[PDB]
Amino acid sequence: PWEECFQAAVQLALRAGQIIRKALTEEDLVTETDHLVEDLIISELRERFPSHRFIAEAKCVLTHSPTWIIDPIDGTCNFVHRFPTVAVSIGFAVRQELEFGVIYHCTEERLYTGRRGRGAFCNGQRLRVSGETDLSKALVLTEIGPKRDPATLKLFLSNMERLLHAKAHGVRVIGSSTLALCHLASGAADAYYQFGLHCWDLAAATVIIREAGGIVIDTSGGPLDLMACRVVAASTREMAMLIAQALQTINYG
Amino acid sequence: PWEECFQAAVQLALRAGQIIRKALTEEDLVTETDHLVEDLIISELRERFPSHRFIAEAKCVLTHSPTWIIDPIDGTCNFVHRFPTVAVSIGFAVRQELEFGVIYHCTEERLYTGRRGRGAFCNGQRLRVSGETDLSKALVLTEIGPKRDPATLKLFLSNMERLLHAKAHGVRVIGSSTLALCHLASGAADAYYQFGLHCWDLAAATVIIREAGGIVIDTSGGPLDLMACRVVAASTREMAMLIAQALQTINYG
């Protein structure tokens, strides 16, 4: 698939961002809009492409038929706290390979879109990653998984410690893996990494991060594995490795 | 002092944000705008209030005469990386006590202003902190100091570890202490904490964080000390303590 679905996704992404931007208007039970958004998006594509499959929130089991990997609201915590960093992400795959991705920054109203072989764009502007190969001039982004047990957050702190020790020019934790991947998608950041993020968070962000220079691999260096809750994206393969090589396998799924 | 200076600060903050928003337009030597901004701001107030003193970037030595504590650009790193989170902060003090504060989010165009006894406002909207007393429902913000030696970033990771362990509902690192303090200033965040941040970073943010419920104290619980590169702000005295009590003295100045 191509064009028709891509346009449908954009329009849904936008309509969605609106309902969630609006939902943010006033004063933990607003996990209803999440549904409403996912409900809006899916009930419509499921009615326009009846043969398609849908992946959202074991479950993630990607087939060869065109499937939509959707994250109605990335950053619920931000949302529940009205911290203006939340998104809607719609990625589309066919033949078990990511075709396009659409990500809307609801409050800032930034629409990141990337179609394979067609490049990446954020509100009309064509995104290009940075060329940053030196991990000492890198601006690394990350997210603290959903866990909290002393064991998992032992390698978390240490892993961040390694990057910091690595003389890392700076690390940011914005609470929205998708939007963080979108910063890397543009000049904004030089690399992202994490464990515990699901397939619907990197589905769309990867088509973009790729269509704009960038590289998305496994926390091992190996090829990207949607099923494994782990990823490492960066401006260049150089950086993509120094980060991965310096990481330490934690365990999510 | 009061009114006249406050208006002058707003206008300078705005004009400043513009030059820096504009400076962000295109493709590490743009540490000139920093000067230009600080130069603009100071050369004008120093010409409108000749008897005033100015504090900016030992140095911080606050007197009883009206002095301006200025941070021309908070978040140079973000700036150097075009990560859309950078600010201009202008705080004003008289009688060794903070009178008002003005903070401009250059890209988002958000103008946080707070005058003691007159409350806090962000673009006309009146800010109020959250009521969050439970550290398990808190959204904590922080910043990694400018250091990197293994010792200082031993308590950093551990201190964050303690909050996380404390079952902290979430932690964010946006690279802009002022703007983070402004999120806490509004509903956005429930608490902030850090070591290694200078007096010009919390000068203005404190008048605001206070004029909106909020509390700003020392990482010890004691009263706020501008001179010490350390602060702990929060929605309520409850939270303000759990955070402080669980911290571990690091050392900056």
Layout of helices and strands, plus pairs?
The structure is a homodimer of 253-residue chains.
Chain A: H1 3-23, H2 32-48, E1 53-55, E2 67-74, H3 76-81, E3 87-94, E4 97-105, E5 110-115, E6 120-122, E7 125-126, E8 140-141, H4 152-165, E9 171-172, H5 177-185, E10 191-195, H6 199-211, E11 215-217, E12 230-234, H7 237-245
Parallel strand pairs in A: 1-2, 8-9, 8-10
Antiparallel strand pairs in A: 2-3, 3-4, 4-5, 5-6, 6-7, 10-12, 11-12
Helix pairs in contact in A: 1-2, 5-6
The H-and-E topology of chain A, N to C, reads as HHEEHEEEEEEHEHEHEEH
CATH architecture of the largest domain in chain A: 2-Layer Sandwich
* CATH domain class name of the largest domain in chain A: Alpha Beta
Secondary-structure content class of chain A: alpha+beta
* Helix percentage range of chain A: 25-40%
CATH homologous superfamily identity of the largest domain in chain A: Fructose-1,6-Bisphosphatase, subunit A, domain 1
Number of domains of chain A: 2
> How many strand units of chain A?
12
Spatial strand order of the main sheet of chain A = 1-2-3-4-5-6-7
**Rg of chain A:** 17 Å
From the structure provided, what is the oligomeric state, counting identical versus distinct chains? homodimer
Biggest interchain interface, per-side counts: A-B, 33 and 33 residues
Query: What separation lies between the terminal Cα atoms of chain A?
Result: 29 Å
Principal-axes geometry of chain A comes out as globular
> What does the largest sheet of chain A look like?
7 strands, mixed
CATH topology of the largest domain in chain A: Fructose-1,6-Bisphosphatase, Chain A, domain 1
Number of helical segments with 4 or more residues of chain A = 7
Enzyme class (chains A, B): hydrolase
Binding site for substrate (chains A, B): 57, 73-76, 175-177, 194, 201
Cofactor (chains A, B): Mg(2+)
Family (chains A, B): Belongs to the inositol monophosphatase superfamily.
